Amino acid sequence: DPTDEDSWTFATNTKNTTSSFNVDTFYQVFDENGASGGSALTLRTTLSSLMCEDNCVLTLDVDAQSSGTPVVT
Amino acid sequence: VNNDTRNVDKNNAILLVSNSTNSQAYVDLTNAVSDAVYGSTNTDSNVNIGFAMYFTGVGDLAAKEVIVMDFF
């Protein structure tokens, strides 16, 4: 959006090994002022067709050593 | 062939990938695959190997298609 601020809600958990779960990017889940900005819709099956050269996905791994103490919350 | 047609081979299928949403994947094979590779008492040279594919949403095929899948 060129006129308003854009909010993007992610799913960055890389180690969620559930088969039905997949890393995805979402647009305007929350309004820019903190309120609800609408429903969340899948985009990962699309980001290949939207000229994203590996620059539209955020992945987070809280514990790189799996020590049982997540660094980042 | 099919199981209901002939019973020459006791087992002829070893699943590796099941309904993956990503065409690009570098997955670690489970110990079951390794066990099944050595899980037959028949002569290894007397049995051939085949690779199978099942997919959906491919109702259009181009002139040239590329298939790359190796073992590490």
Instruction: Give the C-alpha distances (Å, rounded to integers) separating B66 from B23, B26, B69.
Output: 12, 17, 10
Cβ-Cβ contacts under 8 Å, B23 against chain A: none
The one-letter code for the residue type at A71 is: V
d(CA A1, CA A5): 7
Cα torsion B19, B10, B8, B45 to 10°: value is 90
Residue from B52, B25, B49 nearest B37 by CA: B49
- Identify residue A48 by its one-letter amino acid code: S
CA-based nearest distance B20→chain A, Å: 9
Window B:9-28, CB contacts with A under 8 Å? 21-22
A17 touches chain B (CB under 8 A): no
Mutate to test the interface with A, among B21, B23, B27, B56 (most CBs of A within 10 A): B21
Degrees, nearest 5: CA angle A36-A47-A13: 65
Closest CA to B29 of B45, B46, B15: B15
Name the burial class of residue A20, with classes exposed (0-12), middle (13-18) and buried (19+) by CB atoms within 10 angstroms of its CB: exposed
- Please name the residue that has the structure tokens 């090994």: A17
- Helix or strand run (H / E) with residue B37: helix B31-37
8 A C-beta contact, residue A8 and residue A26: yes
Technique behind the model:
cryo-EM
